[model samples]
Target chain A: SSDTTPCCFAYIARPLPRAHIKEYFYTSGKCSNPAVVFVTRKNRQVCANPEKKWVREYINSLEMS
Target chain B: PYSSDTTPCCFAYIARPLPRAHIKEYFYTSGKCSNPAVVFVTRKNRQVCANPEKKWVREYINSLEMS
Candidate 1:
């Protein structure tokens, strides 16, 4: 239902080549909003919208332990 | 040449596999411990390292298993 608020595990990572930026994962949370948020590390600012599945997968790939 | 006696501050981010001049906060895994995770940073205007195993890092990862 569109009115339902969801919830899941959340994570944030700063990936390569653009190590100066951070990406967020707020899975299944409150809104029907997408999966991630990109933030610039320089001054702590949001740089982009929620990314796609690929971005999520990319963040997952870096997980260890 | 660099001397072996010097302990240069090194870092590993949970996101990438590159190097840096200085690292404020980053994450990593050592793969063989009850909880093996780390975050490097500066605290109280002094450089320091902290292990966040029992904290949010491990806590969040644990949540993934049940979800």
Candidate 2:
């Protein structure tokens, strides 16, 4: 069920243990298609999903706030 | 009377190079302990979500514009 939780993004920073979990998004492959692009603390390139309600709602909240 | 239909879902894809006109901010995601996030919709109906503060995603999105 956790896999189906539908997070927008997932990534692993070196030296850390496991991949971090994000409810809002996740990126796949390269910049071919439209995707949620995110940066890591190390400035690593990554992507995420944006269709989830939690992700979309949070995004909407940012503009308002 | 429950139907099997469900809400429509969206995804990202590569759109042909086009002008950035009609570009608008749609959503943003941030946290008290995570990197900030922002989403932009282009004229070609491309959904670009990225960290507005960073340069990587911004440049990628900017390159989509027709110079």
Candidate 3:
């Protein structure tokens, strides 16, 4: 099967330290792997695993503020 | 065909969230246009250029079921 909107089929395996994350978004469930895509101030797309604690915490913090 | 003239490239996007029921489907761009976007198609078949930096669009994408 082929996916039309594959945002994050591939993601980072390890966690990252807190830094300048400007914004964050989640990949569609339609993709093979769902991920939290953190947009950095440097204009880089940092992909995070959704299942991890640190990743969720990051996402949660973004959601609150 | 992806980069054809017919395909609309997003220059800017809305951070605001639209009504969920109105959104039907969505897809992500390959960043060919300097700024990449997740284009969401509404139930009325209108395409929405969304800012990936916005959280609402991601929630929409994550919640969208196959229809």
Candidate 4:
């Protein structure tokens, strides 16, 4: 019911604010580098590098719910 | 449905990296396509073709390329 888009590449930018993000999930690590994909307020998929502190924090933040 | 390999896509490239701010995701066209390209999906759900020869395109692909 959410959204799915493979991360061919992850963006090297600051994490969008939590409010701008709707949901996120990890890539299969299949086609490209490992990434945490964040779906935005508009339901757009934004690939993020999982190694970042804020990205992991975001994933952890989602899991607690 | 038949693939764009026959119908054709990306006759021309946008010349620059798709604005990073609007870039949502991207993938390489199958080499079989009439003109292979990097099809960038923008935040608006639109496609922008990029010339792979550009240095920025290579960097983007490098970041996305499997480790």
Candidate 5:
């Protein structure tokens, strides 16, 4: 494992590029890639590598209706 | 995207887990680590999300009043 952890969910408050995401997952069917990624500082080239623990917490907290 | 309400605005519907802007504003003021869950479906059906605690709601609500 590298020093970075792959983010589970990319929660973006704004827009971003999809190509950057394509570098990792094969997201051809799922809108290809998100126009944005969840990160602190918004950067086009910076990789989105938020810890997965936060993503898990977010999904677990979601109330399913 | 956040934008100033400089022109006529129209909202198709408003939905929130709670009522009253002040309650939502409280969430932000308290430094709560929660996303502003309130959303407004514009007349064009464009979804816009704004903070309940911040001053963004004033512009959003004011714009919707244009219709």
Candidate 6:
């Protein structure tokens, strides 16, 4: 998984093909497949998947107390 | 045998807007031994009887909170 973040261009370039992008979504839709919020300051695209967010909320509300 | 059984079963409504779910995960006793397990039931009377294996079966009544 040799991946890098492009810093030179206004829109960060992706080394992987478009098909691979779709594959990434198909495989890791639960955690890694982030929802594109917006582009970044470094010209990199921003994305977030709800894995740690929901589970943490779930566990926190647990009645183990 | 206990008359009132209270287990931590997660419950949710399938028809609610935005987030359609209410859950309570619980454990119950059987044959004098208690076994803990997670149970998710929706308002549509849909039960995740033995692990939700099919996606359409789920989305049919309730939607997963995913974009």
Best by lDDT: 3
Task: Evaluate fnat for each of the predicted models and list the values in order.
Answer: 0.00, 0.00, 0.00, 0.00, 0.00, 0.00
- TM-score for all predictions? 0.24, 0.25, 0.44, 0.46, 0.21, 0.16
Task: Rank the models by lDDT, top first.
Answer: 3, 4, 2, 1, 5, 6
Structural RMSD, model 5: 16.4
Better of 4 and 6 by DockQ: 4
Per-residue lDDT tens digits for candidate 3, residues A1-65, read 12133255345656655678877887555444456787778767766777889888888888888
Q: Candidate 2, B1: how far from true, in Å?
A: 31
| Residue B45 Cα positional deviation in candidate 5, in Å, after optimal superposition | 0.6
RMSD of 4: 14.7
| Most DockQ-accurate candidate | 2
Residue range A1-65, candidate 1, lDDT tens digits: 01112221232333323465454434333323234443345534331223545455645643431
Task: State each model's TM-score restricted to chain B.
Answer: 0.26, 0.35, 0.78, 0.69, 0.32, 0.24
The top-ranked prediction according to TM-score is 4
Computed on C-alphas against the true complex, the DockQ of each candidate is 0.01, 0.03, 0.02, 0.02, 0.02, 0.01
lDDT of 4 by residue, A1-65 (tens): 11222432436476678988778877563343465778888877776777889988998888887
Model 2: fraction of native contacts: 0.00
Return the clash pairs for model 4, or none: A9-B64
Candidate 5, residues A6-55, lDDT tens digits: the string is 22223333333332322222111232122213222333222222344543
- Count of steric clashes across candidates, in order: 0, 15, 0, 1, 2, 9
lDDT of 4 at A60: 89
Q: How would the candidate models be sorted by TM-score, starting from the highest? A: 4, 3, 2, 1, 5, 6
Write down the TM-score for model 2: 0.25
- Which model is ahead, 1 or 4, in terms of TM-score? 4
Question: Measured with DockQ on alpha carbons, how good is candidate 6?
Answer: 0.01
